[PDB]
Design a protein around this ligand. Sequence first.
Ligand SMILES: CCCCCCCCCCCC[N+](C)(C)[O-]
Ligand SMILES: CCCCCCCCCCCC[N+](C)(C)[O-]
Ligand SMILES: CCCCCCCCCCCC[N+](C)(C)[O-]
Ligand SMILES: CCCCCCCCCCCC[N+](C)(C)[O-]
Ligand code: MET
Ligand code: MET
Lengths: 600, 598
Amino acid sequence: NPKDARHDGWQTLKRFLPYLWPADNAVLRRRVVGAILMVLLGKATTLALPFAYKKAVDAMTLGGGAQPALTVALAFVLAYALGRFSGVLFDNLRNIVFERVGQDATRHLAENVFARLHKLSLRFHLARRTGEVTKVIERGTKSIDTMLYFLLFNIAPTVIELTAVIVIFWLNFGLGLVTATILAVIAYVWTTRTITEWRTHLREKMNRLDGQALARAVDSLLNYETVKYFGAESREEARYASAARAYADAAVKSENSLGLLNIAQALIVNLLMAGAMAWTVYGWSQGKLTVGDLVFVNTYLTQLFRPLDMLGMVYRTIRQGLIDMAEMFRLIDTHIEVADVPNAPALVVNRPSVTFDNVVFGYDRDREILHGLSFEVAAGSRVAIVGPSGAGKSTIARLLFRFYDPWEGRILIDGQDIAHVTQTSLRAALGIVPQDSVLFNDTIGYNIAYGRDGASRAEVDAAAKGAAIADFIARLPQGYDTEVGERGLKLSGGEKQRVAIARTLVKNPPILLFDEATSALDTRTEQDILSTMRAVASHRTTISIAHRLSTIADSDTILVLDQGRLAEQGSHLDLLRRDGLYAEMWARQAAESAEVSEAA
Amino acid sequence: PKDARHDGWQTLKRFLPYLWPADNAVLRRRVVGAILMVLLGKATTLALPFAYKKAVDAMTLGGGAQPALTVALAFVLAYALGRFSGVLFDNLRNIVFERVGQDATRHLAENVFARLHKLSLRFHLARRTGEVTKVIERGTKSIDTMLYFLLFNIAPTVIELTAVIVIFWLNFGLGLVTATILAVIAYVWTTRTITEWRTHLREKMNRLDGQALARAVDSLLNYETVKYFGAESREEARYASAARAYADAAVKSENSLGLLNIAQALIVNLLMAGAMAWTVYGWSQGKLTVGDLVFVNTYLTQLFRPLDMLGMVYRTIRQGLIDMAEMFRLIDTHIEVADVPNAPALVVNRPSVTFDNVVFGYDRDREILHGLSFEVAAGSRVAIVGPSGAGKSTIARLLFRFYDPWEGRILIDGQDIAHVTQTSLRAALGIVPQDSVLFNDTIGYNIAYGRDGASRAEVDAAAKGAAIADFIARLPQGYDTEVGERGLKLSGGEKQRVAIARTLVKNPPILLFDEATSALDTRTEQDILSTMRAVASHRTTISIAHRLSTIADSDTILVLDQGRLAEQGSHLDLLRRDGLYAEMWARQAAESAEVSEA
Ligand SMILES: CCCCCCCCCCCC[N+](C)(C)[O-]
Ligand SMILES: CCCCCCCCCCCC[N+](C)(C)[O-]
Ligand SMILES: CCCCCCCCCCCC[N+](C)(C)[O-]
Ligand SMILES: CCCCCCCCCCCC[N+](C)(C)[O-]
Ligand code: MET
Ligand code: MET
């Protein structure tokens, strides 16, 4: 089991590897093989061509059996040029071919993570900032992609070439040459890495300061009026100038350290150039080596250290990518709190009754909210759930869609423990109008159509009518194609709740929940929409959870919760008659409504 | 001057004074230093392949292994030292000039910031923080990249290209010269056209990425809703397709990159083949040495190494020059409201406010005030009310002179506010706007904002005067409490009290409440109204309110209709005239009843 290992880069990459070698596609497997073959051809070519250079030199200095020397040299020079062009071609062909492999791989990883995120429990509250989260995911995507590219198309070939060059230097020179270049590459890597850590620290500081300056400027601009009102121009300008200066200093330091890494790098490389070319020419002096061997060794070395010119950035980015990807898998690895049981059957709603059987529950184990709540909602009946501040009614909706499970006890629909049925069918039996209805960044038509997967234009029309929002849409310039939400037309509160009613209508569920539906609304809007809602609840089981008792007074029966249990149960008149908790409540709210009316 | 072809050249010619300040002698020294490292670096890198040529020549000239060893050692060592030194010079010019670049782009930014604060309000300076920040980030990155590439890639490459024309001319060719010239021209042209096509593909690819990501994020931030309608599979499929679209776009874009590189290498290596062949054929005739093969090869590879990236460079430079142009457009846009030449200060000895037949509208095709006239006597509490077309929402902005009247004038004391310095004018005016805005800073900074050198004593006094002092007391950090986002979120009454406090610190003779209570709940309104009444103590006060009840106790009330003064007088006088104010009053009262009925 791969998860039973050390949590380092290697483990991340071993986890990512199946995405590159699917066994499910085979097309991409072919693309992978093709790409590796282009890598091998590219290396073959770039390693081959400098011998063509050497041979051209030899033919011009030992024209003893290389004759006519003109023809031999011309042949080898053209061989070399053609070699260069071909090495390039093989490289871009491996890039192009593998691009599809990379995009598909990271795409499937992204898809898996998305799915899992939609499987995890609500308690993570993934309702935050669009701009921040998007800056983060953008950042991470750029990160993982860059590490992917650098790994497959810089580090891998450079290791191939590094070993090939070791082999060739071993068989044809040295071996002092081999130990010299290996010592060289080790020093270059150690140096680049240690310096790069320092540079990454400086880089982060520069980016923090930049953010601060930009933020200052932006905050000043979006507040032009206020800056005008209090004549604070000079103040704001100076206030930006200091931040700006701070940034400039940070940037100067950062771009200086870049210079030091470059100098250290060139120092190492060019000592090795000096030493190796000296040894080669001296070796020629003794009649052991040709003059073409100078050209050969030199070209071999510059070709070797060209890709390592970027090692710093590469190292910074790859490292970071591997960090981000660890995180990806960490999410995929987090366990799912609410899961379907194995071979779960579907919920079969023949007669839509609702049962709470002794439910104990709380969002956290150190604060219990339902203390053994029990009740029966009869099929087709309309009931309400009211109670004071600790009653625990705001758990009901969430327990019913099974966003969470009870600590103890159960919830049934038609006599079926909803914890033993498939979550999708369970939620298929449920409608909800929430207090805060949210709109997708899309058209009002799409948002209404959302209630059911394959919804027709007719179904949408029918529902918008049944919610009484059809006329409002008719008067819109673009009608159903009107873009709404953020970045689009702002809808009123009543309108949004009407869209929501419409949605649940498209879904047409056998059980409907109003979960503080109108508590976000003004009084007249509430009064208006209450009639609409009253209409929609016609022949369904409906459960209304409300702060204001008056808006639910017409219930077939009312459930009164206190301290997480069922305190009172019955018709509005029975409850006012018992002079118990519901009565008290009623009275108090009434008093409030009176007092507020006086202040005019 | 500004009278030019408005092309990259004009932008750059304009940016040049920033690199050669004449105000800063130090940075001028730094520029001379950087240019000197450019010349040392080029001298060096053009020289070091001569060292290579001689070492090859030494080994082939060349009877045996004579003192050729010593010479060859000497020249290869010279070559290596040369390479290193070229790099050294390059990074030193980078380092030396970095300060120049940073200062220059800083002062340009500072100029733009400054002018933007002089330019007129009507530039709709209300958007999204993330959008403007992403934009400004984008553009600064742009200009920096464009600047670096220009100065430290294209410039040295032009220097080096000309050097190579000279050298190839004097020592070979001249067919060699014309061959490399034709090579570079084809390389440039090819790289340019392919880059234009590639930029279009890149733009498409970015749009597609954005769309896919947006779909994912909007899906997650609405987890609850997706759960409610069991729409997981649906949203997943919705992301897969957008994601595939993006992938295809990416593949296409990176393919076009492949073609750009292949074409580039074709040009470079055709030139390499021809030049090296002709060099060898020249050796065969004993005219050129064997070191000349190495020499020509090295010169050509060194020449075309910086043009390796010409694609990106050209894209980048292009965009940078665009973005910089944009900067200058701002600096060049004319300032709608200016102080007249030698404008005197406003002197407020008697704080009367006079509107004299003011005609105004934000745009010339929609007139709002059609000759508005009134006198606000010094020290009085006056309100300005009216129905939907009265034009009352203009008063505040006209009084602070965000705009001048089309016709007519505004006086404070006896003085035309269009003939005085804006700062003295605004120093005489305090304002509590409808949406009070808080800076991302401490409550102390926000209140102290009201006057430049405001003491903590003054902050205390004002916060007391606005009755928010006690609230601040119960804060852990008190006045050092960070507010705004990401800071403590304040209630509406609290924000309006911070605002009142601010204007208190200013201590102006004229105070405006501009729909001050229109964003607040009823109890909050009633609360803060008494503070607002207290604060009006020895000032001229103008309250502009939608809800008439909140201004009934004014000394006199100004009633505007269709951009003119219809009625004027005390609350009772006005109800007594049975006119417009009366009607409004009744109507408003009636509404308060209906909501109470429900
Ligand atoms: C799967 C390919 C693209 C996925 C996008 C990357 C996700 C962003 C990074 C997640 C968290 C990063 N970190 C470590 C800073 O928290
Ligand atoms: C509509 C666009 C207006 C843009 C002008 C704003 C210039 C302000 C300076 C921001 C620069 C931040 N910096 C340079 C530190 O990155
Ligand atoms: C240190 C860098 C300071 C330079 C400030 C440049 C900000 C550029 C914003 C330009 C946006 C132009 N536009 C409309 C094409 O996006
Ligand atoms: C806070 C971490 C959550 C990240 C999980 C989201 C996965 C789907 C988004 C991938 C974006 C792919 N992109 C940007 C290339 O289109
Ligand atoms: C092509 S950016 C090179 C920067 C430096 N040579 C490094 O290794 O980080
Ligand atoms: C990763 S640098 C690629 C440079 C490319 N040859 C161009 O000029 O666009």
